[PDB]
């Protein structure tokens, strides 16, 4: 809980399987500058499984994403954002 409060990384869920890294850049860039995005893939086919990580350069931008992007639509699906301790190699599957 002490970590989640300094993080600039959001875990995004309920993404459609057809959602791309570019669409996520367009949407999440509305709250601030994105440092990096890592899409979640199938451990076998290497195909999207409905989630991703969004890292912002500043805490303020990630908070505005949690305030205004969370709960809105992308590819007509209501998406969810949650604070995340940070990406770790392997968690993209």
């Amino acid at each position: 809980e002490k970590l989640l409060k300094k993080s600039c990384t959001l875990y995004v869920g309920n993404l459609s399987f057809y959602t791309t890294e570019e669409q996520i850049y367009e949407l999440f860039s509305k709250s601030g500058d994105i440092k990096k995005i890592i899409m979640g893939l199938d451990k076998m086919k290497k195909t999207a499984c409905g989630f991703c990580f969004v890292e912002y350069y500043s805490r303020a931008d990630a908070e505005n994403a949690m305030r205004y992007i969370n709960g809105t639509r992308l590819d007509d699906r209501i998406i969810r954002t949650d604070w995340d301790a940070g990406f770790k190699e392997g968690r993209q599957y």
């Binding site: 791309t20 570019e22 949407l27 509305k30 709250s31 205004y68 709960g71 809105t72 639509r73």
Partner: protein, 722 residues
């Protein structure tokens, strides 16, 4: 901590009436006076300046408490005057206005004698007499006074009509001699119809005039204290300690002038309550209170929507229209919205969920109106309109009755309406897929849809082997595929026949074409061969050529161009100045008025600004000599970035003007409107930073000789703090 909760939450949801909660809280605060008089006074002074939307609820409380303890009321009134002086000293003019309004309304509660406020306002208005002080200083004191009148105007005129008329005469003569140079730079629309966008003081003045003409009677403001007419009386009044407005100093920062956003009138809502006119104080109070409600809850979109919708009034009003108008007034406010743009988009969605059967129709009606008034809407506002509307659409399956906008089809593509439609479809595509967006519009609109974002390879399966560096590119292609190293690529590039402009072209063309699968591949590619880039783009001419070649490859994919430019800046492959020069280059000439261009420029300026703040924050903490020099060097690159941009603007605008005079054609073309307002936008989005360059700008760039079309934009910028 208990009192703070009772005070802050008083007036919210409850089973007991407000009058019952107020009277109750009053007794609770009195009993706790002997032990928490100092705390209670602090909390009451806090709510006075932080919760202006609850003005009359707290002034009633203070009145009920003053009626139980006259001395307490005296110390509070004294503490308020103290706070006001403090707020003014800390340049918190916005909060100062709320305190002044609170003292004013206290007159109605009979906590403060009317002559005390009349006296205070005479002093306020005299500021318009001070010499060699900013018009924005004089303006504020006049605004603090006039904006308090909807609440205390009747009580003051019945007590000191003669003294009040004198003040008005002096107020009017000052308003008549104010400069309006800033107006053109702050209006959302320049057209007079259907609604003039009025300078805030002229508008407020007209509203006060009408109120006076109406014998100071207004029908909107909720006055809880009227319910205690038997408990609140003159016998309990206090006289205010003399008040001297703090003199103008070097560190004095005053609010910028404003223009009143206006789009609705009662004929837009024939089936609902009659909408208060533009020149009635009721309209002013309604918007002022709705703006404050957002200011208090912008962070909580759900709570913000609930608070807006539950806004109470003495009489019925078409609240949904007032809410929508206030949200657009904030989003389109110049220079900038009070809060982050995206918040407004989500707020409107939350409002639609809360009032599904009425708000959507109003928003739809408003959207149609905004489109129809596009011809004179300022470019900075148009971008926000484009971004809001496209985002909104993606939240409602991109459904829209485009046929209503069929009038854009037969106009010059560069015109506001058709350009608006194309930019919107471009943004929608970024949140969707090409064929999908191509399909949401009617057949007659297909030509306005964005082109398929495909990569363009100069040395691919189509070009002639007779192209300079053809054979070289061929080797680069296989080299990258075999996961070669920088050294390898460095060797291959030597076969390039001539800063070698061809080395860059074959390298950029090939490398990008191979990583054209996604943003990730492209980014990683920029990382892998980062050494190659920094070497080829060592000179300014090299950084400009990299950008030029990158554009020739990705011109059909604006978003790709933006993310690549941002990466090249952050990894220092190119610098901000190179991007600024690239923006005004001949290659981008046909795309100059497109949104993405300005998005890249501002995103580039922002990175420079944040870089300056970063170093400043560091030198701040470590206070060593190795930084004080780093700061002044970064601030040097920042200042130079702005000088180059202004330089290029003056250059292309002068060229345009000379060309028009040469050919005898009019200067007012769609290209021009866009170019002159983009210059305006530079000053608007970064006025704080640019004010540091005044002396330089006045002597080197925006000189007295400069064609007035261009110099005026600079003079308008100057007026924001004059």
């Amino acid at each position: 901590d208990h009192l703070e909760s009772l005070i802050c939450k008083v007036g919210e949801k409850s089973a007991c009436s407000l009058e019952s909660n107020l009277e109750g809280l009053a007794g609770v605060l009195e009993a706790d006076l002997p032990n928490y008089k100092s705390k209670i006074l602090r909390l009451l002074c806090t709510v006075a300046r932080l919760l202006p939307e609850k003005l009359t609820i707290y002034t009633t409380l203070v009145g009920l408490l003053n009626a139980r303890n006259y001395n307490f009321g005296g110390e509070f009134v004294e503490a308020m005057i103290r706070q006001l002086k403090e707020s003014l000293k800390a340049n918190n003019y916005n909060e100062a206005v709320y305190l002044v309004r609170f003292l004013s309304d206290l007159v109605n509660c009979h906590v403060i004698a009317a002559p005390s406020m009349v006296a205070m306002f005479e002093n306020f208005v005299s500021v318009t007499q001070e010499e060699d002080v900013p018009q924005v200083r004089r303006d504020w004191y006049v605004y603090a006074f006039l904006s308090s009148l909807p609440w205390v105007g009747k009580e003051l005129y019945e007590k000191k009509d003669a003294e009040m008329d004198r003040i008005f005469a002096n107020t009017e003569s000052y308003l008549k001699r104010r400069q309006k140079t800033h107006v053109p730079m702050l209006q959302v629309w320049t057209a007079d119809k259907p609604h003039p966008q009025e300078e805030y003081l002229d508008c407020l003045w007209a509203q006060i005039q009408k109120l006076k003409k109406d014998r100071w009677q207004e029908r909107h403001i909720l006055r809880p204290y009227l319910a205690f007419d038997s408990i609140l009386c003159e016998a309990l009044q206090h006289n205010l300690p003399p008040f001297t407005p703090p003199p103008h100093t070097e560190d004095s920062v005053y609010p910028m002038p404003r223009v009143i956003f206006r789009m609705f009138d009662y004929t837009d809502d024939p089936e609902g309550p009659v909408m208060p006119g533009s020149h009635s104080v009721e309209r002013f109070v309604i918007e002022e209170n709705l703006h404050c409600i957002i200011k208090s809850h912008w962070k909580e979109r759900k709570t913000c929507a609930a608070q807006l919708v539950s806004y109470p009034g003495k009489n019925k009003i078409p609240l949904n229209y007032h809410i929508v108008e206030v949200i657009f007034a904030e989003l389109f406010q110049l220079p900038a919205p009070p809060h982050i743009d995206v918040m407004y988009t989500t707020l409107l969605i939350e409002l639609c969920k809360l009032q599904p059967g009425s708000l959507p129709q109003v928003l739809a009606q408003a959207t149609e109106m905004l489109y129809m008034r596009l011809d004179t809407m300022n470019t900075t506002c148009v971008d926000r309109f484009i971004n809001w509307f496209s985002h909104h659409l993606s939240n409602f399956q991109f459904r829209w009755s485009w046929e209503d906008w069929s009038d854009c089809l037969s106009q010059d593509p560069e015109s506001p309406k058709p350009k608006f439609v194309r930019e919107v479809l471009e943004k929608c595509m970024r949140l969707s897929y090409h064929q999908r967006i191509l399909d949401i519009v009617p057949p007659t609109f297909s030509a306005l849809c964005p082109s398929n974002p495909t990569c363009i390879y100069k040395y691919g399966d189509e070009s002639s082997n007779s192209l300079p560096g053809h054979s070289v590119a061929l080797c680069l292609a296989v080299a990258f595929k075999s996961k070669a190293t920088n050294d390898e690529i460095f060797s291959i590039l030597k076969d390039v026949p001539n800063f070698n402009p061809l080395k860059i072209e074959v390298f950029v063309q090939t490398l990008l074409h191979l990583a054209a699968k996604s943003f990730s591949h492209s980014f990683s590619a920029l990382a892998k061969f980062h050494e190659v880039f920094k070497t080829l783009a060592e000179s300014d001419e090299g950084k400009l050529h990299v950008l030029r070649v990158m554009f020739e490859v990705w011109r059909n994919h604006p978003q790709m161009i933006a993310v690549l430019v941002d990466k090249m800046i952050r990894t220092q492959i190119v610098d901000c100045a190179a991007v600024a020069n690239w923006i005004f280059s001949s290659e981008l000439s046909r795309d100059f008025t497109r949104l993405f261009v300005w998005e890249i420029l501002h995103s580039t300026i922002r990175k420079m600004n944040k870089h300056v703040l970063k170093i400043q924050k560091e030198l701040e903490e470590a206070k060593i000599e190795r930084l004080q020099e780093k700061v002044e060097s970064a601030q040097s690159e920042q200042k130079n970035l702005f000088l180059v941009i202004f330089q290029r603007f003056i250059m292309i605008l002068t060229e345009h003007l000379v060309r028009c005079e040469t050919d005898g054609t009019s200067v007012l073309t769609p290209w021009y409107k866009n170019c002159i307002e983009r210059l305006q936008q530079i000053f608007l989005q970064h006025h704080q930073i640019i004010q540091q360059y005044m002396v330089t700008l006045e002597n080197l760039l925006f000189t007295a000789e400069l064609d007035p079309h261009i110099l005026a934009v600079f003079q308008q910028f100057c007026a924001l703090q004059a």
